[PDB]
C-alpha cells in the first residue's frame, strides 16, 4: 500500500504545516501537524478542556463506531518549546493520503498548553519519530508509520515541504519527479528516538565550504534551523546590522536586508538554503526587526535540521531495518 496527503503551511511564515488526516467510522478529518521529533498522535477532542479550545476541530470518540478506549492507558508529553499536552488513550482507524492503519492509538488532549490553544489551525500532532519516545503508560504504543510499515510497499515516508506554499508527504513510495539529481542517503542513529544523523558541513551564501561535522536530528515539527553558536554567528556576521538580542530570543536583523543563502552537507552532497527561507518577517507588527529563520542550538543540547532547511530538500526518512535519511534537492 501507499498514501499520499498535501501539506499545507498554517500562516505566511510557514511556521508549521497540517495535513489532514482521517480518524474514525465515520471519519472525522482533523489537521494535524506531522512531526519527525515525536512519537504521540494527539488530538484535540471532545475530553478536551473547554477553555482550552479555541476553534480546533475535536474528535469526538463517541462518534466512531471503531473507537475502543484503551483501557488504563495515559499520555503526557513536553516539546522542545516548552509546550505541553496530556490526556488518555482510544484506538480508533487512522488514514492518511489513503493509507489506512486499524487499531491505532489515538491519544485524546484532556488538557493542553497555551500556544496549543491559541494555534486555531492545527487539530494535533502526529508523530514520526521512534515508538521508543511514545508516551503512553503503561504501555507504550506505535506510530502511524511503524503501524503501516509492514503494508507498505517499500518502508519509507517522504517530506517535500513547500516555501509559502503546500507540499506532500507521502508514505511507501519515493516520487522521482518530486526530486532533481540524485538522493544521497546518509547513517541515522536511533538512540535518542529521533532520526539523528550527522552533516558534513556549511558554507554562507557564496562563501566556501568549511568541513565539520554536525550532529542534528531531521524534525519536521520544528520551525527553524537550530545549529551550533560558532556556526550561527558565521553565518549572521553576513547581515549588516545582524545582532543576537537577549530580549526577543535570538537574532535579529534589519528587514531592509538581503539575507544569504546557507548550504550544507549531506555527505559529498550540498542542500542550499535560499535566503529568502532564512526570513520570518517583524519580530512584532510594524517591527523593522526580523527575526532569523537560523538560530543558535546552545542550551537545547541537540541541533535541530527544522523546516527551514528541510523545505530546501526533498527528504526520504527510510525506516527499514537499519533506518537512513535521503536527500535530494528539488
Given at each position: 500500500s501507499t498514501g499520499s496527503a498535501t501539506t499545507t503551511p498554517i500562516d505566511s511564515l510557514d511556521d508549521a504545516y497540517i495535513t489532514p488526516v482521517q480518524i474514525g467510522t465515520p471519519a472525522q478529518t482533523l489537521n494535524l501537524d506531522f512531526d519527525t521529533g515525536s512519537s504521540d498522535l494527539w488530538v484535540f477532542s471532545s475530553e478536551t478542556t473547554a477553555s482550552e479550545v479555541d476553534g480546533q476541530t475535536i474528535y469526538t470518540?463517541?462518534?466512531?463506531?471503531?473507537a475502543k478506549l484503551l483501557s488504563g492507558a495515559t499520555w503526557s508529553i513536553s516539546y522542545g518549546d516548552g509546550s505541553s499536552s496530556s490526556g488518555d488513550v482510544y484506538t480508533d482507524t487512522v488514514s492518511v493520503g489513503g493509507l489506512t492503519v486499524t487499531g491505532q492509538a489515538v491519544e485524546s488532549a484532556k488538557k493542553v498548553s497555551s500556544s496549543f490553544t491559541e494555534?486555531?489551525?492545527?487539530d494535533g500532532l502526529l508523530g514520526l519519530a521512534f515508538?521508543?519516545?511514545?508516551?503512553?503508560?503503561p504501555t507504550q504504543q506505535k506510530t502511524f508509520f511503524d503501524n503501516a510499515k509492514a503494508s507498505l510497499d517499500s518502508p519509507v515516508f517522504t517530506a517535500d515541504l513547500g516555501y509559502h506554499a503546500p507540499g506532500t508527504y507521502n508514505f511507501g513510495?519515493?516520487?522521482?519527479?518530486?526530486?532533481?539529481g540524485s538522493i544521497t542517503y546518509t547513517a541515522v542513529s536511533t538512540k535518542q528516538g529521533f532520526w539523528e544523523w550527522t552533516s558534513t558541513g556549511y558554507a554562507v551564501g557564496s562563501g566556501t565550504f568549511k568541513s565539520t561535522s554536525i550532529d542534528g536530528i531531521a524534525d519536521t515539527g520544528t520551525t527553524l534551523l537550530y545549529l551550533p553558536a560558532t556556526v550561527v554567528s558565521a553565518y549572521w556576521?553576513?547581515?549588516?546590522?545582524?545582532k543576537s538580542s537577549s530580549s526577543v530570543g535570538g537574532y535579529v536583523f534589519p528587514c531592509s536586508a538581503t539575507l544569504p543563502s546557507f548550504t550544507f552537507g549531506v555527505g559529498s552532497a550540498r542542500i542550499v538554503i535560499p535566503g529568502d527561507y532564512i526570513d520570518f518577517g517583524?519580530?512584532?507588527?510594524?517591527?523593522?526587526s526580523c527575526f532569523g529563520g537560523i538560530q543558535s542550538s546552545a542550551g537545547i543540547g541537540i541541533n535541530i535540521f527544522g523546516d527551514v532547511a528541510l523545505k530546501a530538500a526533498f527528504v526520504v526518512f527510510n525506516g527499514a531495518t537499519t533506518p537512513t535519511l535521503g536527500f535530494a534537492s528539488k
Open positions: 470518540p463517541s462518534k466512531s463506531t471503531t494555534d486555531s489551525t492545527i515508538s521508543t519516545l511514545n508516551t503512553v503508560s513510495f519515493i516520487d522521482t519527479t518530486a526530486y532533481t556576521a553576513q547581515v549588516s546590522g545582524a517583524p519580530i512584532s507588527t510594524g517591527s523593522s
